[PDB]
Ligand binder design. Sequence first.
Ligand code: K
Ligand code: K
Ligand code: K
Ligand code: K
Ligand code: K
Ligand code: K
Ligand code: MG
Ligand code: MG
Ligand code: MG
Ligand code: MG
Ligand code: MG
Ligand code: MG
Lengths: 153, 116
Amino acid sequence: PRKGPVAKRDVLPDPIYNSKLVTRLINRVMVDGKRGIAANIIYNSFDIIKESTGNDPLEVFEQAMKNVMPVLEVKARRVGGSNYQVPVEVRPERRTTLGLRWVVNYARLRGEHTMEERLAKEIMDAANNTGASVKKREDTHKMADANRAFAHY
Amino acid sequence: KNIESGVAHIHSTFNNTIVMITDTHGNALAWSSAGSLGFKGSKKSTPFAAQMAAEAATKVAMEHGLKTVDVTVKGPGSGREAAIRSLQATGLEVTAIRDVTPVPHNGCRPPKRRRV
RNA sequence: GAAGGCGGCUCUCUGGUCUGUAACUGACGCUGAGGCUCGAAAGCGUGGGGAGCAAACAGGAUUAGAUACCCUGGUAGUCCACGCCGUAAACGAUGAGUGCUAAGUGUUGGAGGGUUUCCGCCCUUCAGUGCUGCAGCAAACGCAUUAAGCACUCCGCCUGGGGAGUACGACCGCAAGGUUGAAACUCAAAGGAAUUGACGGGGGCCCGCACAAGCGGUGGAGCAUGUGGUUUAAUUCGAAGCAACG
Ligand SMILES: [K+]
Ligand SMILES: [K+]
Ligand SMILES: [K+]
Ligand SMILES: [K+]
Ligand SMILES: [K+]
Ligand SMILES: [K+]
Ligand SMILES: [Mg+2]
Ligand SMILES: [Mg+2]
Ligand SMILES: [Mg+2]
Ligand SMILES: [Mg+2]
Ligand SMILES: [Mg+2]
Ligand SMILES: [Mg+2]
């Protein structure tokens, strides 16, 4: 808003994984305030991850975050009669937000029958540095590089 | 075939910047430009494009064999300092810098102002 | 420099201005219709020249169109000599001459003096050029020893707006056109300055889910409902951008 930076409300850590990141993931996947459904989905997907791989699902999820969280975004800037994209370093909060949003959206776009299954598959692909979310991050970086000449802006 | 000292001319106008490394006698050795590096439209005039063009020309000249050069800047383009720093970073020792922008002593009549 | 205007350097010819002195003449001065001379830029004629720029023109863009703005080229012209043209917001939009009426402060070219070793610093004074500012003037804006103040001489010019700087005539000009210059008819305004708003593809600074960041929607489907249109004997009346239409 015009007044200035606004206060950001904190979240509490997850009951079982003790992860504010897990809580944020549950919030992102939640719809119409059905947090019970969201949490059950997230925990079932994490169990699927633990079954399919020997790594801790929390670590796999953080690997996916490391592989999906962007570094340089493109923001449209209007100069005179010319509007063009400008690269911008992504602040960590927006990095996490983008990671969660991309993961959830592409999990919902996946083809498997159940949401927890889709989410587990997407998380594992992101951890392996592949999949729709990783492609999205790569394309964001590609656009930033393409418009890199406007860094001085 | 192999050189030690040279001159880097940076002709940087409002639209494009050309970097040309020649021997001290003015025989061209290597050259590059924002347009030559694929930049188009506005990007051709950006400081970054000057940096990349200077880097490419510096690499070609150094492959030809070249340690030190003196820089001659021409035109009002903004990418002059970017090109100079690009040369220095890429390795060519910038011994001296000079500005050779033509300054007519009146002389010929310039074209009309734009939008009139 | 009278004005137009005059900007590299050199030499030849040449005009004017200003400051001293007080030797000279002894009002010989000012203005000045008609006349004559000069008179930016464009333009015209003859003959040269022609880099850059650039009417016209060509192409490419833009756009609804774009005989333009923008981009790429580009002829005349822009330059020279001679000769025409004689018009400009040819403006300080303020004729010339003369005298008088606070100051303050820059700067240009001199002159004198008091210091200063010289430089320089101070005072005075003359002629320009600027800014600020009394009295006075002004509709106001503002001018104010460079008057738009106080006075006198001469010249030019004005008498509501349009028609119209047009028509006819006349003079000038190669021509373009210039000078002089109406009338019929028509309106009750036109106009100058300033004030309050409103507005601006003016500026500055601010606020609002206004934008930006997200979530979820509508517009696609069936249905409910309101409206329009149409139909009807009637389809009662009102509501119509925001701010009418569960
Ligand atoms: K003289
Ligand atoms: K001619
Ligand atoms: K003076
Ligand atoms: K009348
Ligand atoms: K609807
Ligand atoms: K309606
Ligand atoms: Mg001429
Ligand atoms: Mg042109
Ligand atoms: Mg006249
Ligand atoms: Mg004076
Ligand atoms: Mg928005
Ligand atoms: Mg609908």
